[PDB]
Design a protein around this ligand. Structure first.
Ligand code: HRE
Length: 87
């Protein structure tokens, strides 16, 4: 319910899936990141909980080649490294 402010490059990713504002709830950020993953088919076909994000903007932002969608705490870490103070 509190608002977060994405850094420019995370904001660019969000806007690529139709987001139109500067600040978001965490639930909204997750929804759009999810949309990005699914519409770009970044998940592995055999192990569908694994997202392969090397050579993609998402991998650039998160600083990892891959991650599991089951690892929610690590997902929050990676999102938080891409936020700035809300002014
Ligand atoms: C490959 O992934 C999936 N594949 C399938 N297939 C049918 C193949 N179905 C569901 C998922 N899936 N599971 C979860 C999520 C998805 C989609 C929306 C990416 C989201 C989610 C994961 C990562 C980010 C980031 N960056 C943002 C949202 N997510 C969540 C992650 C967190 Cl932290 C909180 N709540 C969530 O639902 C999950 O558990």
């Amino acid at each position: 319910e509190t608002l977060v402010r994405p850094k420019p490059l995370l904001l660019k990713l969000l806007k690529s899936v139709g987001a139109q504002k500067d600040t978001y709830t965490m639930k909204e950020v997750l929804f759009y990141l999810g949309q990005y993953i699914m519409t770009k088919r970044l998940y592995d076909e055999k192990q569908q909980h694994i997202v392969y994000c090397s050579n993609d903007l998402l991998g650039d932002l998160f600083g990892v080649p891959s991650f599991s969608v089951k690892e929610h705490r690590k997902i929050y870490t990676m999102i938080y490294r891409n936020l700035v103070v809300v002014n």
